[PDB]
Amino acid sequence: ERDCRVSSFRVKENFDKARFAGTWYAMAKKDPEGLFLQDNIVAEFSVDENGHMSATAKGRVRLLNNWDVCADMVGTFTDTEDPAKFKMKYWGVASFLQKGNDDHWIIDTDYETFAVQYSCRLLNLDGTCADSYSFVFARDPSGFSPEVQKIVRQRQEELCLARQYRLIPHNGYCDG
């Protein structure tokens, strides 16, 4: 039944950049292949006068050589024909941190409690996703109500990502 094609995934209706501004604590995540942020992830979103969205993010990353580093990351977003789908250019303040460009979609959000984000980095020949990442954010570091948890589980299912997220710890590693 349900369609796993990236192109059929619903997104946030009439997304509002200005209401999305602010601090968002990552609560759970579904990792992509390769190096990614491990934990202690906190993102901060901003929208200037011209409507240009940007964000800064802090998170712990395990370098291949076993060092643990706190990554200071920056991302700028470009608008598209869909208010909830953006192209994200990102880079770190330290030269060794990953740089790239990645789609950034806002699956769902109430602006005040939770948000579900999603990025497909590589499409299969059938249109499904072969390499994705998804974050579940909260406005409160204490998490969500059971009521909101139900909604979030729903969205995970529609991303065909159910049963594949892991809880993310916050223990002050990058100053929390």
Ligand X SMILES: C/C=C(C)/C=C/C=C(C)/C=C/C1=C(C)CCCC1(C)C
Toward ligand X, which CB reaches closer, 122 or 145?
A: 122
From the list 6, 17, 152, 3, the residue with the least C-alpha distance to 80 is 17
- Minimum CB separation of residue 54 from ligand X in Å reads 8
- Minimum CB separation of residue 170 from ligand X in Å reads 14
98 is in an annotated binding site: yes
- Return d(Cα 39, Cα 58) in angstroms, integer: 9
CA distances from 32 to 23, 95, 120, 129, 175 (A): 23, 21, 9, 11, 25
Within 10 Å of residue 153's Cβ, how many Cβ atoms?
13
Q: Which residue is nearest to ligand X (CB)?
A: 75
Toward ligand X, which CB reaches closer, 116 or 144?
A: 116
- Minimum CB separation of residue 135 from ligand X in Å reads 6
DSSP-derived secondary structure letter, 157: H
Toward ligand X, which CB reaches closer, 54 or 128?
A: 54
Residues making contact with ligand X (CB under 6 A): 35-37, 43, 55, 57, 61, 71, 73, 75, 90, 97-98, 117
Toward ligand X, which CB reaches closer, 38 or 128?
A: 38
- Minimum CB separation of residue 43 from ligand X in Å reads 4
Residue 142, C-beta contacts closer than 8 angstroms, at least 6 positions apart: none
Where do we find the tokens 């060092």? 67
Q: Which residues are annotated as a binding site for substrate?
A: 98
Q: Which residues are annotated as a binding site?
A: 98
